[PDB]
C-alpha cells in the first residue's frame, strides 16, 4: 500500500551490500551489449500493413500459387563508353561474357540475367524497348534468389561490389534492393554520426550544470550501460517475434535522453542532501526515498502512456513499444540500484578530484512573481496563439514508402529517377482481382470473362491499348508457383493514383458472379488498408490514454482539477506540435534549408508521435506539480506554493531541456525523412511545452483557478488516496 516503508528498505539493503548490487549490475549489463552488438542481421525491414486485412492474404495467395515476381528485384542502366550505339557487337560481347561470368561466380544467389543484350538481333515486341530510340541507353535485370525480404537484400548486400564494376563502372543500379539497402546504411550512418556528434556535446552541458568532472562523468556511464542493456534485451526479444529495424535509433534516442537525464536528478538530489553533513547511509536513503520515488513514477508514467501502441495492428509499432519499455524499464532499474551503490561506494570524494543559486532562483522568483499580478495578461495571447496554431491540421494527407524519401541530390534516387525518365511504363502498380475457387475445382472458362464484364464498369483505368478486348489483363505466371486449376487472378493499372481507394470500395462491393470471392490486393490496397485500420482505431488509443494518463496522475497526488489542467496543456501542446509538423513537412516551408522534399506525412507515425508527445508533455506536469504540492502540503499558501515550486524546478528542468534537445538536434540532421519527422517533433514539443507553456501559463492558470484546486470529493478522495500509496512527507530525524 504505502511503499514507501518500501523504498526505505530499498536504500538500508542497498547500502548494506553496495558491492554485490554494482558487481552483479554492471556484469550483466556488460554481457547483455556484448550479446546484442549483433542485434543487425535478424531486424527484417518489414511490417507497415494490417497483417489480418484482406488485401494481404489476397497478395499471399497471389504471390504463393503464381510464384512471387523478380524482374524488378534490381534493374541496371548500360551505356556505351566510347560515345557509340548500342549495337556495337564489340562492345556488346564484352559486356555480355563479363555479366556471364559474374553471374557464374556468385550463382547461388543470382537466378540469371535477362534482358535485350540477351539475343539483340530478336524481333520480340516487348523486349525491343528496353533500348532508347536514339539507340544510346539501355538496360537490362537481375532476379536475385531467396524466399523472403531479408535473404534477398542479403544476398543483394554480399553481390553489391562484384555488380558495381561493369564495363567501366558506367552500369547504373536501380530498383527496389538498392533503395532499402540505402535506408539501412542510412540508418547506419544515423547512429555513427548521432553518437560521435552527441557524445561530446552531452558531455560538455554536464560538466557546465555540475563544476565537477566525476558527478558529471557518473551519468554518461549509466547511459552508456543502458544502451548495451536495452540493445542486449532487443537482440533477445528478436527470436520470437521480427523487429523492425526502425528501433536501433530509438534505443540509442532514449538511452541518451533518458538514461542521462535520470543520473542528472539523481546525482543533484544526493549533492544536495549531503551539503548537510549527513552521513552517506542517511544521505543514500534520502534521496533514494524522493528521488527515486519521482523517476520510478516518471518510468511508469512514459511506460503506461506508450503502452497504448499495441492496440494497433502494424508490426512497425510493436517493436517500438517493447523498445521504449525495455529501455525505459532498465534505464530506472539502472539509476537507482547502481547510481545509489556508486554514490555509496564514493561519498564524500564526488566533489574534489577534478578542480583544475542566487541570481537564477532570483531570476525565476522575479519572473513568477511579475508574471502572477495578472493572469489574463498572460493567459489570453498565449492560449489564442496556440489554438490558432492548430489550424494547419485541415492538410493533413497520408501514404506510403517512395525514393522520395532522400535527399534530393542523393545517388540511388537520382539514378531511379533517370531510369524512370528515360524509359517509362516499367514501373507500374496494378490492382489485383484474385479468385479463389470455392466450387468447381477447375475454374471452368468464361467466368473470367463474366467477371471482366462486371469489372468493366468501373472507370479510371488505364488502357495503352486503347480497347476494353485487352482490359483487365492475366498475370504471368513463374516456374516457382503451384499453378492451381482453383486459383486465377487478373490485373490492372489504374491512372489517378491519389483516388484509389473510392475504386478500390468499390470493386469490393462488386458481387462475384458465382460462390466464388474476390479480392483487391494490390500495393494501393495495402496502403489504403494500412490507412483505414490506423484511423478505424485511432480514437479508442487516444481515450486510453487521457483516461489512464488522468487516473494515474490523480493517485500521486489527491486531486480532481489538477489532472484536467494537465490534460489541457498537453492537448494545446500537442495539436501546436502536430500543427507546425504539418505546416513544415507538407506546406513544404523550410524544405530548401532542411534538404527534403515535401510530402504526405508517414502512415504508422502519428501514432508515435502522439505516444510520444502526450507522454513527455504529462512527465514534466507530473513533476513541477509533484513539487508544488509537497510545498503546499504543510502550510504555505497558493502563491507562495507555486513560486518556491517553480524556483526549484527551474535549474533542473532547464538542464532536462538542454540534454533532450541537445541528443534531438544532434538527430534532426539525418537523411531518412521520418527521422527529420520524429525529431523536429520532440524538439518543437521540449522547447513549446517547456519555455512557454511552464513559465508563461501554468502559474496564470494556475492563479485564476487559485485556491481551488484540490476541490476533489471527500469521499473517494479518502478512501482511495489514503487507503494506499500515501502523502508520506519526509521527516528528517537527528
Ligand atoms: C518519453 C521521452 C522523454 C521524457 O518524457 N523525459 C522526461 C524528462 N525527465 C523527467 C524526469 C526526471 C527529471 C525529474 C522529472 C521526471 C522531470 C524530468 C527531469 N524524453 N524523451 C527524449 C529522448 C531523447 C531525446 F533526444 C529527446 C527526448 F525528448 C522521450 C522519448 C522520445 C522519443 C522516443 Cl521514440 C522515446 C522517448
Redesign the pocket.
Known sequence: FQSNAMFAWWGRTVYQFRYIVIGVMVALCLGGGVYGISLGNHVTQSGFYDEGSQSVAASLIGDEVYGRDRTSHVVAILTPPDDKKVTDKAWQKKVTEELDQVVKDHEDQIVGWVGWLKAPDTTDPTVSAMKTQDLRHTFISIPLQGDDDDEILKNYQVVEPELQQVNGGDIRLAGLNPLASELTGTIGEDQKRAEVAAIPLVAVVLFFVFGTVIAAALPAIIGGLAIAGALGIMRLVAEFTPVHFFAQP?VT??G???AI??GL?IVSRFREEIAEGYDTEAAVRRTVMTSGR??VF?AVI?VASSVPLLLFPQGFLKS?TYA?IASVMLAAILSITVLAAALAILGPRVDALGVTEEVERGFWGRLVNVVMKRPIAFAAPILVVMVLLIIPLGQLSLGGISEKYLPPDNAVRQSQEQFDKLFPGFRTEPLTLVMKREDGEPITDAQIADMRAKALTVSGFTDPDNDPEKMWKERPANDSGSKDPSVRVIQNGLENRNDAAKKIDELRALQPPHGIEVFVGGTPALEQDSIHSLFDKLPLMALILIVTTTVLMFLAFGSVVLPIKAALMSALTLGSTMGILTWMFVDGHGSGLMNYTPQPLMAPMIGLIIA?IW??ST??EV?LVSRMVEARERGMSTAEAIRIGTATTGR?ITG?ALI?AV??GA?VFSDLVMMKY?AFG?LIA?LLDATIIRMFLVPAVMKLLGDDCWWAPRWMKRVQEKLGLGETELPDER
Open positions: 530509438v534516442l532514449i541518451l535522453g533518458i537525464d535520470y536528478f519521482t523517476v516518471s512514459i517500438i521504449i510520444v507522454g513527455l512527465d514534466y513533476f533542473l532536462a533532450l541528443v534531438a538527430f520524429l520532440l521540449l
